[PDB]
Symmetry: C4
Subunit: 388 residues, 4 copies
């Protein structure tokens, strides 16, 4: 086995087609299934896996009470083949309340953060072995992507932020080789309060679309040069913005350079990617809350400030149903690199108070250059049928 | 690994021998097992798998209520090694309320249809990656075989129908290479309403025996030329007809060319195959309902209109037990190609109203050129022992 | 991969050491575990598996009621790695109420008998594919070994009896090559009623020690010539006899040639093997019932009629606990072939009537040339803690 | 594959980073999970596994009652990939109420002791086969390490003790090659009572740190010459001692040569390792009971009697939570050999009497040469939420 390079152009797509759905919450009502959140998807060259942060309990279990809290010592990174639900035989790959994973063509790298909020440890696990670690550098909360990292030619890159709810954010970009940290670069350019990057290979570089936690409903973009470790950043140009909350479509804006100061907090993890002058992106259908999900393309939305010219809309989850985080992953075909995405479907607290638990399922779609129809693919659990 | 060609003569069989049984419903009464329907079986060169359309729930689970409905967004295609029941570690391979799968010698192809009734999407997944998609061409329930597709020399063929189950039904035959659609041919010949084809290789071509949903209790036959993509069709010659409902054996008929207009609707998925002038075929034992199952050969039943000369009858499931859909799969031996079949054993609604769910198990038989005995292998669950 | 030949001498042993235990019944009281009987063990060159005939149900399940009956259509052959209990992910390899399995160095062969009592079918499954079948030749009850068959240089041999409670037994030895029956030899020599052979390779031939159902508490022996397909048979010489029931040790006998006419019915499946003039053997501790288990060597017990000279006795299961069938399997080391055995530990009906089910666990021991101590390794479940 | 030699220097570590946690007890309250104790970890060159001694039952199962008792015939050695909890599909690798395991670069060796207290058997299983066995030499509870053995160049070593727990016991060091015992050496040097050694490679030799059961709260050290089979022993020099119970830090001592006679009984399994003149070690935080866990380095604590100079402390489990046994394992990187450890987190009896069972989970950490933060990673189960 050789290192992956992702050295192919991006597939020209017309939209997205259904790929996978796990039905975790529906299954939790008649079986032993992990309580989770912050899922994502990543593929080795041989196959695709779903990941998530467990809460150290199954759902029909009294320890599921209070699982809205993000950071406890019992959280571990779960890894299962895509489509296989998170049952009791699922592997806990490392201890983590924040994570990122990727495969370099030879082995899996996992970045796993756990410990005290303000003095955390990030472990780097390469090929099933502990290879390196780093402590929190600012003693705010050290956190990472909650989606796949990206490796080119044996060098993997991951974005991390040591930040706090007060809008403090010290963002650094790590370069890692067989689990060893070989360089760390500070964030540079105009992006301001970066969390939870969704990154993708754009050979010879890497590009991330992130979450502005504090001041922008427009999404930050980071460019990472894999050859000399230099960094740049800005915001997605599209006047149809990707975060939640946000203004409505006729009053929303972006100038490509600065956070837009429109309903900037708290934001939600999401994704977007460039196709020439155009941008493909997802977002929640609601402007206020994490409900529904839609994808579309914005013509000129990548290079012209404030374009609002959409086309190729699809509903993924209708607006009567809960969504959550979303993110990108990439797949190498014979001649081109395809872009896919997942949507976290959160059930329970805080929106549904009949139960005491918090958990999610997922749905996944992939780029197609064929044709397709319409639908809606929500979580599908009836909250009244669940353990409490 | 090379592509499969199926370029051997058909095994001369004397009947069928027991091969596999999954006991799903019996197991569902003391364990977490998936609710399913529309199962089938397909073998790679290395092993066999069972497939089915899940209902996004286990059986001992309140979400099993109402699983008589065919099309919900939570249906996924389940895949498990043959004989491993559909438990909670089962892989959901794609989102689907109608499907077909086959292995081309290198990798698995799955065809997965989901979404709105009037605007569905069919996804094509090859080697674990999304390779193509199509949208509905008549806007009235795009649907496919619910059994294995067939590949020769890297080209896979699958039959799909869209449109009104009564009138203006539009059947198309797709040709697919590594998951990309390379050609689509319209149905041609005298077959009139086609659904749920059971197909098999007949080198260098492919042949399918289908279900006439509307006017015929005699089964349609479709021939598919894999060299030039041309199509022909007619009806199985045998005066002993294969659909349900049907007339009794002394008043049933077929003229090879047209639907017989004898109790044509609604039909059931089934199979048949040719051996020279003879046909081997399965059907339900009851002429009225989906109860029992029997196989036999009809001498001259392939090439002479209205032959009623049977031999080699076997009871697979006795007429005191429910059956369901059935279909064919093929297996390559060292010197010949064998034919096998599966029977869906449907339990619950509509026939059994003590419970609120609908599900199935399977039983599977394969051609033999040896000797064999008799028996009956029904589902075996006691409806009174079940969750409700 | 090449075919196995088992062309190594037998390891010289001093006794047996503990190898595996599955604890099935103890686990069944707090988990979903298959109901089974007639287990055995067999190893491919890479690993060992435990096998058993399921009853189409888990134990904590209302379908476990009435599982004392030996022959229903829902019985399937279960296969799991040795030490992994028979849980819901266990593979049902074929449909069977009697079976035998073995690995030829390239693939698994399973012999699986199911159907009507008096008109059964035996299927032969090689490398996951149905390769042949045979019907009952006498229309009594067709049955096979309930332990491993043996393959040498690509030819596998298995012993089958088509027999009935009226002392009738038509015994045949089959020779099978990649799942095809290539020859069938009748039983020959002085053994009279043969059931449930425990067989082992003894290069270039195969040797079996069986159960006499009717006239002998001394065990029949069969020799199988793998070059010309000829057969011979006789009875184990040892005056300490291996069947149950049997006379006590001072009044028991064998003349090497004939059944001893001492408490000959019904017997139990068991094993023995030769080491020069000596025999190693197991048997129940009780002379009346299937309780306890012990092993020992009888000096001159293989070649001198009526030798009662035991040495190296070990208790495996003490005489306050239920045993059951036992059998032999063989393991290829780098320089020699070791002999190992399993004991079925039957719980429930008919001996324990608080419950309505019958099932078993197993314990497994292997030949050692070292030293060892003492113990007792029974099933260990408390019948009062079980589902009913 | 070649034999492992561990012929690299020890990684220069700055402390330990989080690696794995299994959450067994928390899962256990809503799922079928094995009752265990005496866990450990060991890695093949390809992956890591967790091991433990099962109690022949799951926790939500009436057979869990009374599982404080250490030695029953139903105890088996459980083996699972690190992070996969001990669920019903877990492999039981051998029968054992005491064990040790290790990989020599080609295959797994397991040492498994079971049977009567006064006449036990130790089985040696190599590459899934029984290879050798030994009987008890002092007739008073033959027992071994409860952590990984160590192999260099194909020869594996394991330390065993038989005889009175707190009298004179008879400790022997076994040398094993492909499962065959090739030499046994008696303990030699000044160590007096030895139990439950934690051993590691220190090329070309092996070094163990053990438990003095009777007279010392300072830990015995054994040196094992792998080429010559010669043995030496003494006590860890550090005045900060590693056993439990022990005196407080200002009145504790060690003279490197003798047990310190300070609260010597009963002790607990633990570990330490040398780095030049320094020692790295773990211990319980409490001096009286098995509560909490901490690691640190003692400067000059390996070569100067009574050093109390600690640095680089880390809390692993805080002192409001139960700990248990701990031990070491080693991992081969590209340029150096890393040291890792596990901690057993015991729940239930005798400390927690609301329930009738005893079981544990684990947490695992590995050496790092990077930086890290702080935390506490206890078991996390609420005793009030558990089956009784
Ligand atoms: C079966 O399923 C298919 C596949 O899912 C469905 O087809 C979808 O339908 C989507 C919804 O209609 C559609 O996406 C929309 O696209 C329009 C842009 O539409 C175009 O306008 C441009 C601009 O010059 C033009 O390029 C287009 O091309 C024509 O020809 C081309 C080929 O050359 C082809 O693309 C076209 O089909 C067409 O023949 C076409 O004219 C966009 O405006 C839509 O966005 C508005 O509407 C949605 C609601 O659907 C809102 O949520 C948005 O906010 C937005 O509305 C705002 O903006 C409006 C101003 O534009 C304003 O009027 C509103 O008030 C509001 O402020 C949306 O992006 C897909 O492109 C199409 N996909 C494909 C592949 O065709 C099909 O409908 C299904 N059929 C059935 C029966 O269900
Ligand atoms: C143990 O297991 C085995 C294997 O399963 C069982 O063997 C089965 O048994 C099946 C039922 O009998 C049988 O299938 C039937 O086949 C007959 C055709 O049989 C032949 O008839 C022809 C000529 O017309 C004849 O020449 C044949 O030759 C004999 O001798 C030669 C020697 O050279 C040899 O080649 C042959 O093997 C045979 O020994 C032979 O007799 C067929 O007629 C049956 O069809 C009617 O019956 C079934 C009920 O069984 C009805 O449901 C059907 O609807 C059908 O009924 C129509 O037929 C009549 C004529 O019109 C009419 O009365 C009715 O009203 C109706 O209209 C059926 O298909 C298998 O062939 C046989 N398999 C084999 C391999 O032998 C065995 O029975 C089991 N034993 C026990 C003890 O349980
Ligand atoms: C710890 O564990 C070990 C191993 O598990 C225990 O030592 C076991 O003990 C077994 C039980 O005693 C024993 O098996 C017995 O063997 C005797 C035969 O004993 C031998 O006699 C021959 C013949 O002259 C002689 O060669 C032997 O000398 C030595 O050399 C051999 C080398 O080949 C070696 O095995 C030893 O080193 C050995 O000392 C030796 O003297 C046999 O007579 C026993 O069978 C009778 O007793 C049992 C009860 O155990 C009955 O159930 C039988 O039916 C049988 O009784 C019949 O015959 C009697 C004599 O005529 C008569 O009185 C009765 O009424 C009846 O008709 C039995 O098979 C093992 O060989 C020995 N194993 C080993 C490996 O050494 C040790 O006991 C354990 N310790 C503790 C404290 O638990
Ligand atoms: C985020 O996480 C990190 C990593 O976990 C935490 O950092 C660790 O913090 C611990 C706890 O403090 C440190 O361990 C302690 O080490 C003490 C010795 O180090 C200091 O003293 C020596 C000289 O004797 C100095 O040389 C040191 O070095 C300084 O400079 C060097 C550069 O050369 C750097 O290494 C350092 O960064 C410093 O800048 C240190 O200043 C050691 O004394 C201590 O042991 C006592 O304390 C504990 C409680 O912590 C007791 O339980 C224990 O019994 C010992 O107590 C006895 O000791 C004395 C007298 O004998 C008395 O004080 C007591 O009463 C008692 O009798 C412990 O081992 C650890 O080294 C450090 N790790 C690293 C890599 O730095 C961060 O704190 C955490 N941050 C936050 C914000 O949470
Ligand atoms: C989850 O835990 C909460 C808080 O511990 C439980 O609610 C409490 O119930 C007790 C009585 O058992 C009251 O005295 C408290 O005042 C309640 N607190 C709150 C915040 O409501 C709750 O019942 C637990 N949920 C479940 C399903 O057991
Ligand atoms: C399954 O669901 C059905 C309907 O979705 C339930 O039946 C209804 O129960 C309601 C509420 O009690 C009644 O008012 C209605 O008359 C019922 N509807 C129908 C169509 O009968 C049914 O009880 C559910 N079954 C189970 C076992 O939960
Ligand atoms: C297992 O099945 C048996 C036999 O069917 C059940 O016992 C019978 O129940 C009938 C009808 O309900 C009673 O009238 C008889 O007293 C029983 N008949 C016989 C022949 O014993 C038994 O109840 C079942 N066991 C469980 C646990 O459900
Ligand atoms: C676990 O088993 C123990 C041992 O029998 C039970 O504790 C005893 O309970 C019996 C009656 O059930 C009492 O008479 C004894 O006094 C108890 N013994 C001791 C030492 O306290 C206990 O009931 C069982 N626990 C559970 C949950 O079943
Ligand atoms: C199977 O597929 C291959 C690839 O298409 C075929 O390859 C050959 O056949 C072509 C058509 O006859 C030739 O003109 C090509 O040059 C040639 N290509 C290669 C790579 O050999 C092959 O014939 C097919 N085999 C069968 C039995 O249909
Ligand atoms: C990547 O890596 C090596 C050197 O580190 C180089 O030789 C190789 O040719 C490179 N390949 C690609 C695709 O970048
Ligand atoms: Ca924002
Ligand atoms: Ca019809
Ligand atoms: Ca007998
Ligand atoms: Ca001590």
């Amino acid at each position: 086995a050789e290192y992956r390079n992702w050295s192919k152009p991006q597939c020209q797509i017309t939209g997205f087609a259904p790929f996978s759905k796990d039905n975790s919450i529906r299954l939790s009502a008649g079986g032993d299934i992990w309580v989770t959140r912050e899922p994502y998807v990543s593929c080795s060259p041989g196959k695709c896996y779903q990941f998530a942060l467990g809460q150290g309990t199954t759902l029909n279990n009294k320890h599921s009470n209070g699982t809205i809290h993000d950071r406890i010592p019992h959280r571990t990174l779960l890894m299962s083949e895509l489509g296989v639900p998170f049952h009791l035989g699922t592997k806990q790959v490392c201890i983590a309340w924040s994570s990122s994973s990727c495969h370099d063509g030879k082995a899996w790298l996992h970045v796993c953060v756990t410990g005290d909020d303000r003095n955390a440890t990030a472990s780097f696990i390469y090929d099933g072995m502990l290879a390196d670690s780093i402590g929190s550098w600012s003693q705010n909360i050290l956190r990472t992507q909650e989606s796949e990292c990206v490796c080119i030619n044996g060098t993997c890159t991951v974005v991390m932020t040591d930040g706090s709810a007060s809008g403090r954010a010290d963002t650094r970009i790590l370069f890692i080789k067989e689990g060893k940290i070989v360089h760390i670069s500070p964030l540079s350019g105009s992006a301001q309060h970066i969390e939870e990057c969704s990154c993708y290979p754009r050979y010879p570089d890497v590009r991330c679309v992130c979450r502005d936690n504090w001041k922008g409903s427009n999404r930050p973009v980071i460019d990472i040069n894999m050859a000399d470790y230099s960094i740049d950043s800005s915001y997605v140009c599209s006047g149809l913005v990707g975060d939640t909350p946000r203004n409505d479509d006729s009053s929303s804006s972006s100038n490509c350079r600065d956070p837009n100061n429109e309903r900037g907090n708290p934001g939600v993890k999401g994704w977007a990617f460039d196709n020439g002058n155009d941008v493909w992106m997802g977002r929640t259908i609601s402007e206020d809350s994490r409900s529904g999900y839609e994808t579309f393309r914005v013509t000129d939305g990548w290079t012209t400030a404030n374009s609002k010219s959409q086309v190729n809309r699809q509903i993924i989850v209708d607006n009567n149903n809960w969504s959550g985080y979303s993110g990108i992953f990439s797949v190498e075909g014979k001649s081109c690199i395809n872009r896919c995405f997942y949507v976290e479907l959160i059930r329970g607290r805080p929106q549904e108070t009949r139960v005491w638990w918090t958990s999610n399922s997922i749905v996944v779609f992939c780029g197609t250059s064929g044709t397709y129809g319409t639908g809606s693919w929500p979580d599908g659990a009836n909250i009244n049928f669940m353990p409490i």
